[PDB]
């Protein structure tokens, strides 16, 4: 009966579907029974003397996802100082206002002050040529590119475009920060330090990096 469920492991309990619904009896039959191996709960009142309690597949919730997450928060940080931290980002837009990756993998955005990390199969290279001592490199997912660039022992300049991840964002504040003319189907993400205005020119106007060939094909 009691056995392993991990990650998206709804297959076994899809037919071994033990159940629990209602208010009374302190969830003893399910929670206290599964205490035999694990029982972990959340509780939230709905009124004086009335409370909602959640019991979870703590071991499954304790899967690799939580392993990666562990160090990714300080859930003791405050709203106003979050807001102050937000100002570190340039936010040029609103301030102006057979497959090779089968054998290679990447881990991205580690220690990132404003975003969450993740592993992925990838291809990770540069351009045919490089005027070295100013360094760039690129990494790819199946429907969005990602790049990084700088030579200065500090936060580098990051750019990402494609069908970007729909939930990957460290803070709760406004995610939309980019081009008025944004594409009909794909999204762009660029992050840089506030001080880059003094040196980065291409952010100040329309476009960069194409021989008058910008659009992705469709017809």
């Amino acid at each position: 009966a009691f056995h392993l469920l991990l990650n998206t492991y709804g297959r076994p309990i899809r037919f071994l579907r033990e159940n629990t619904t209602q208010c009374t009896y302190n969830s003893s039959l399910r929670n206290s029974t599964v205490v035999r191996e694990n029982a972990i709960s959340f509780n939230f009142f709905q009124s004086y003397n009335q409370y909602y309690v959640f019991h979870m597949p703590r071991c499954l919730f304790a899967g690799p996802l939580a392993e990666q997450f562990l160090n990714q928060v300080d859930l003791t940080e405050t709203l106003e100082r979050y807001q102050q931290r937000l100002n570190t980002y340039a936010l040029v837009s609103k301030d102006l206002a057979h497959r090779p990756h089968f054998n290679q993998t990447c881990i991205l955005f580690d220690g990132h002050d404003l975003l969450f990390s993740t592993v992925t199969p990838c291809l990770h290279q540069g351009f045919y040529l490089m005027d070295e001592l100013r360094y760039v490199k690129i990494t790819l997912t199946e429907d969005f590119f990602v790049v990084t660039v700088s030579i200065d022992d500090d936060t580098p300049m990051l750019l990402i475009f494609g069908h970007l991840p729909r939930v990957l964002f460290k803070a709760p504040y406004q995610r939309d920060n980019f081009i008025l003319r944004q594409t009909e189907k794909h999204e762009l993400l660029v992050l840089v330090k506030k001080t880059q205005l003094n040196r980065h020119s291409y952010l100040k106007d329309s476009d960069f990096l194409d021989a008058a060939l910008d659009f992705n094909y469709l017809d």
Binding site: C23, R30, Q50, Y51
Partner: protein
């Protein structure tokens, strides 16, 4: 199909008044040494509803009879995305409604 889980309980004797102007996440050193989800007993929350001395929200945890207070909004914004990437956000279809007001307003 998924595993099945908990309920909402009435007629509790325990209450909130105990804090006596304890209104904030007063403990931080525990944060740099968080127990993982593996080692937690229970977790609690309030949108500072009953508090003159608190406005938006706060949360508490207990682990091996070890406890301290921490703010609620990051987990509200987070666990939704965690479920979404895990593909079980549908299980929140009901309780996401209850949890809705408790993300930060921006």
């Amino acid at each position: 199909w998924f595993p099945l889980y908990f309920e909402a309980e009435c007629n509790l004797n325990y209450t909130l008044q105990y804090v006596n102007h304890s209104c904030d996440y007063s403990v931080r050193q525990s944060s740099v040494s968080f127990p993982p989800w593996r080692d937690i007993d229970s977790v609690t929350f309030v949108p500072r509803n009953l508090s003159n001395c608190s406005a938006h929200g706060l949360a508490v945890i207990v682990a091996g009879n070890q406890t301290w207070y921490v703010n609620p909004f990051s987990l509200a914004h987070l666990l939704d995305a965690i479920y979404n990437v895990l593909g079980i956000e549908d299980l929140s279809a009901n309780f996401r409604r209850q949890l809705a007001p408790y993300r930060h307003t921006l």
